[PDB]
Subunit: 502 residues, 3 copies
């Protein structure tokens, strides 16, 4: 009949989050020690497992699209797409990228130059290796799991007339038991990872936004200021989701996506243009040359440390935690397309903007720390990673206008990403109605207030190292579910191949 709540999933997913969020708020000092102890345990005990499973998804989705299965339509064999490609291409940006592109664009390459994982720092191979780790952390591996989840969700819904849910890919394995205890756990385990990923993103955004106001006006860094920042950021995203406007939203996304390109072009043409163009091509070459061996590097013959638990394993856990939300969002606007076209669009359209942004913005700061002798900019990336971007931007013409534009652009990016997150969260916990509409409207408020509570709890207990620990701990049970879904999809493809010739 009508849409409603799926109680076995809601209660399971909501009793974990609300119990975790109170222990961290009532005991901030005991929680920051245990989360710091678990982060060093994970890097040494389950570090190889993440590196092993992140490559399987990419190899699977590439081999599938290059083979003869890339001819299968994502609907019936005679229906057509519903969007202009232009409107398809632009809807991937709004959901994929967020405010954390401003937090890591300058301070992360300056950290790998002064403290490399192997070698001696401050030289010319440290820079070449740091701009390569930066391409690895934002490249094909991350966009390859989004495409996997999206393809698996669209295939079982538009060809087999099954619900749009994570458990439908287990149908070739257990049949009608996707409506029992086994299928409800798969759906409850996929909400916890999403909540923790969104919380980490929102916490990094609060930290980035608190420094711009300090630079411009003089607002202090206080615990009661961050509460108001969280309130503003989340109340501006709940009221856009419960208001039922999509024209103004998708029209405002595109405006922000043009201002982003204007800012990128200003930064490119107001600096060393030829140096930046040369380093762009150099970085592309280095990444493609070292890809097949950097996928398994764990620095096993060096002296033991905990570098891996804060940089690469964190990134693999973070992309896995964001996969359920972006996959179900891209599956809804891809009916009528073939597998090859879908995969090669998702892998290459949002990646070219991200890698260009990262290259230009990181090389602009490396060039000024190495060649112009600006050491207070590189020392800031270690003690205060939230102020490095403004220290770089204050060396440009009309510096107090570019910063005021950057603050606004960054706020709008976060709003247009959180607004789409709450809708998908309310859909993953509903049941019934038409298989093209979203869940009830009282669940968006609930799943927004829950994320606000989690973020508030995790920042006031350990800052940046607590978010990275919670994500790595909570993304573990969903990787095995992804492997099971891969098995089910492979088992469906063989019945496809037999049925086309028999």
């Amino acid at each position: 009949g009508t849409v409603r709540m799926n109680a076995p999933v809601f209660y399971f997913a909501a009793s974990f989050i609300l119990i975790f969020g109170i222990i961290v708020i009532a005991f901030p000092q005991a929680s920051g020690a245990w989360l710091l102890a678990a982060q060093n345990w994970a890097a040494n005990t389950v570090g190889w497992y993440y590196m092993m499973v992140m490559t399987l998804y990419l190899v699977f989705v590439v081999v599938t699209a290059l083979s003869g299965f890339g001819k299968i339509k994502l609907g019936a064999d005679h229906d057509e797409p519903e969007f202009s490609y232009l409107s398809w291409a632009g809807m991937l940006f709004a959901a994929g990228i967020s405010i954390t592109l401003f937090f890591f664009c300058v301070s992360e390459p300056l950290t790998h130059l002064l403290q490399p994982p192997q070698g001696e720092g401050g030289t010319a191979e440290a820079a070449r290796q740091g701009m390569q780790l930066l391409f690895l952390h934002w490249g094909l591996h991350g966009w390859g799991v989004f495409a996997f989840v999206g393809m698996a969700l669209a295939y079982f819904a538009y060809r087999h007339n099954l619900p749009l849910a994570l458990r439908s890919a287990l149908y070739p394995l257990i049949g009608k038991r996707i409506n029992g205890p086994i299928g409800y756990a798969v759906d409850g385990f996929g909400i916890i990872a999403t909540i923790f990923g969104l919380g980490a993103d929102m916490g990094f955004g609060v930290l980035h936004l608190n420094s711009g106001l300090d630079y411009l006006f003089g607002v202090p860094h206080t615990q009661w200021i961050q509460v108001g920042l969280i309130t503003l950021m989340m109340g501006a995203a709940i009221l856009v989701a419960i208001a039922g406007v999509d024209k103004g939203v998708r029209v405002m996304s595109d405006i922000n996506m043009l201002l982003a390109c204007a800012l990128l072009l200003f930064v490119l043409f107001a600096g060393p243009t030829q140096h930046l163009l040369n380093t762009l091509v150099q970085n592309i070459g280095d990444y493609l040359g070292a890809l097949p061996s950097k996928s398994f590097d764990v620095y096993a013959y060096n002296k033991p440390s905990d570098w891996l638990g804060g940089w690469t394993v964190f990134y693999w856990a973070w992309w896995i935690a964001w996969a359920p939300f972006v996959g179900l969002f891209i599956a809804r606007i891809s009916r009528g397309r073939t597998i090859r076209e879908f995969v090669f669009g998702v892998l290459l359209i949002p990646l070219g903007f991200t890698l260009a942004w990262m290259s230009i913005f990181g090389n602009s700061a490396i060039d000024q720390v190495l060649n112009h002798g600006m050491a207070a900019l590189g020392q800031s990336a270690i003690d205060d990673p939230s102020m490095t971007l403004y220290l770089l931007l204050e060396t440009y013409p009309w510096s107090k206008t570019v910063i005021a534009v950057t603050v606004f652009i960054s706020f709008v990016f976060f709003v247009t990403s959180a607004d789409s997150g709450t809708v998908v969260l309310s859909t993953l916990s509903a049941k019934g109605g038409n298989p093209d509409e979203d869940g009830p409207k009282w669940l968006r408020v609930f799943w927004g207030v829950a994320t606000a509570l989690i973020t508030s709890g995790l920042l006031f207990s350990g800052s940046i190292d607590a978010l990275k620990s919670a994500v790595v701990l909570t993304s573990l049970p969903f990787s095995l579910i992804l492997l099971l879904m891969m098995w089910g999809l492979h088992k469906a493809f063989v019945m496809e191949s037999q049925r086309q010739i028999a």
Copy 2:
């Protein structure tokens, strides 16, 4: 009618072996000098040729299986396989691996660390490079020639109704002349290589077995002890081949293959587990990253030496010499399968166990020579490579029980490999009867006593450097025959492509 002897092949193959084996036994001092002189000549004169031809086989078999020819059945287009995959897979282990997996697992990586082919020894890149040479010597190159010979033998026998012989792949080139002087030389040249490969394997096994008894009881290393060891090892394998039991044999193989995994798991869980898991993933990454360039490395710009004639060219000659026996064994249990399924089973099922064994066992010893300061273990790999495994195993709990189990497991491995070798040897020199049965039973005894004689002659004249020289010298005329067979197979595939469209 009935099976019988193929006299033109038997006399040609038996007059070379019996004449070679008496000269070495009657003149042990003059034979050890000439075999040592030939080993340094070969490494410099025909070293590039082996590296050039070993890559052709692998590229051929991979491109064939990835193309549209991978759809062709290895029988008629409507018959089905005869085995359970489980029993097909387990039968590849029994024939492929032997007792020499215990002789090289610990002492070879410890040799590449203290005496690298390029660089300075005892450091942390010497270990990373040695564990990469070890993966190259036991990886895809060796299992890629087995698959080539097996596919070529099954194709011409189950689709064109030709004999199961090495000369049938020359039919598209010379027609009915495979039953004349040209086809008999091709079959006689393939028995000599097999005999010398088996002799080298048996000699390394005698050396490995003589040290365990010294460690346990106190048996000396004497020339009259090795004669009794050879007698026991070969008399235990002739009586299993002339007795006509396959249930008890294939059932005892599987028992030994479970004890091997139990021993591997004990060694993994009784040591530094996390270090070993990390180094496993690191080794996989390093091998896959350096594969396309290490295929042609001959160290040509360095100072001249003879490193290549004892390590890499020896391994290429040894795999080529073992190809005729394993190919005809795997061709008999693969009727009804497609080319792609056969190739991707043979390349990946027996390789994962071998590479895991090598990685775990080599890293366990590198970790204890570098980090725990055990120099008498690394000095033993240079002066006495037969005692290094026991020196490593004596640092574990209950050390005198694990060694007594290892000795037994190693003896059973050799027996289940030699038993299958003699049957195929008696088949390669027979003619007539049904094309699913084996040759007469008086030829198994003959080809076993011949191998015993060759091994006895080669050990008492130069020990380990004489076996490596004889193999490299006697595997030269069979590589050209393999190239001719590749030409014939390519010429048959084009007549396949037309007939499917005309």
Copy 3:
């Protein structure tokens, strides 16, 4: 009706060349400074663009031949080839290779050893890196653009019944407007690049030929001697083109192509044969291992210099400038073949001879500068690159006969390449008649005298650095036309794919 002149193309292409050629002859001192200033500007401003576009052509032609489009015939689906493969294979040599193979074979690897682009010179990694740059500069990248132009020209002429011209590949974009102002500029811009490439080749040939006569007889290096050398070289190639003989020409080509192999075998067997064979395999391995990363190397993190504008960007501009002449020559003898067969013949038949020549001749000189202490041979590659080959050849048996043979072979190579250039140049500026015949005979004389004038002007103003600058400056507007042609070909392939299933 009959063939005639295409005046809008002729006047456009002939007013640029004749105006450029007089300014350089009337002002030799002011022209050598501006051409030297432009060479350093280009290396820094448009260096990344050439590296970016040269890889697109290769990736396009490889992916096209490996896909299902490699089955399309280059004519009608039922006609057969017209040549014997033997006469097809041999006609690619005569047009592809020229006299500049003798100018760079010895002096270029000796320059990269003593002045590497990165590192320290005179050691054993400088040699390994120089023999790798030499393989990059004469390998797959250059032969991959020839195949692209040839395939694009044959496809639109033998399947769609369009003229054999460069503008026919713009038909899917603008239709009947290929016979107006847009199509005439595309054809006029393709003659200027060809003229400048031919001029550079002829200038290097004059320099190489002037030193052999100095060595043999004692002819000085004078400005009035080079005028006579140019007169002889070009008058011997106009009289072969206006005489109408192809049997004697294609028959004399094959004779020269046998003398070349005889000379290569003499040089291989009169020196260190085993060292040379080992280094050949080593070079193949190094090139294939470093190919996917050396395609984007611009040395961006090193100290700024102008190395790129004289070595790699010059080579990319030179191959692009030679593409229009060789593409239209190979398109005329390839009717009836499939795309895959054409591409894999062009990529692999002329490349194996070139890479073997380069390897043997460069390693013969590296081995004698490093190991035998011959420093006057390596100092000559810096101050006088035209005399290095004779200094190397004078250390062989019967040295005054090999040099007299080399001079003749080099002269005949240039003649058989220029003779075919003038015919294609007269065809690119004609219109009418049968689409299998060549243009009028008064245009061959014109386009030969024009090249002579350009060469005379560019050598008397800056020698070797002026040719390299003119080529890099004049090959810029044709790369964009090549991109447009790629777009048109892709747009035609999709109408192929739809029409085979509908």
